[PDB]
């Protein structure tokens, strides 16, 4: 029962950047962890590969996860179109962190932060799920596309995911 790895490729107008890979805690938060690795390895049809990075924001985090309309208004889970809050154990303790986008309680799907700050707001708010755990450079070379509205000057994507271990 080790936590799963997986990885993304990253690309910037379609040239390869770097790979980026992330500890998910699935002893901590299994529901949630197994979200965004099904996600990540397509297994159940639909996911993450192909789809981009929506809204960075220089000094506070990376968005994405929306693969349906590709603005921040769609995106699901495996679960459904929304799952609840699992916890708030783990808190928003710096850069590298990987927590869940939402809209209100309970509604998780599959948009997720990348946070290049500590965001301590967050807490009690936004399921934390994950972390960086190679590749916190290449997260930075993506922040320095993004701007102050959130709006990227080059288009950022998944261009291939998976599981590591």
């Known amino acids: ?5 997986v990885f993304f490729d990253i690309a910037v107008d379609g040239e390869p950047l770097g790979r980026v890979s992330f500890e998910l805690f699935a002893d901590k938060v299994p529901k949630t962890a197994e979200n965004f690795r099904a996600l990540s390895t397509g297994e159940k049809g639909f ?11 220089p000094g506070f985090m990376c ?10 208004t769609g995106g699901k ?7 609840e809050d699992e916890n708030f154990i ?12 939402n809209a209100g309680p309970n509604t998780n799907g599959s948009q997720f932060f990348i946070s290049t700050a500590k965001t301590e707001w967050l807490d009690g708010k936004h399921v934390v799920f994950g972390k960086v755990k190679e590749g916190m450079n290449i997260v930075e070379a993506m922040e320095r596309f993004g701007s ?12 291939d995911c998976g599981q590591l271990e």
């Open 47 to 57: 996911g993450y590969k192909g789809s981009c990075f929506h809204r960075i924001i």
């Open 148 to 159: 102050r509205n959130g709006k990227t000057s080059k288009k950022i994507t998944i261009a």
């Open 90 to 101: 783990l808190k928003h303790t710096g850069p590298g962190v990987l927590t869940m986008a």
């Open 77 to 83: 889970s495996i679960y459904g179109e929304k799952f």
């Open 1 to 5: 029962m080790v936590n799963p790895t």
């Open 63 to 72: 968005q994405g996860g929306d693969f349906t309309r590709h603005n921040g």
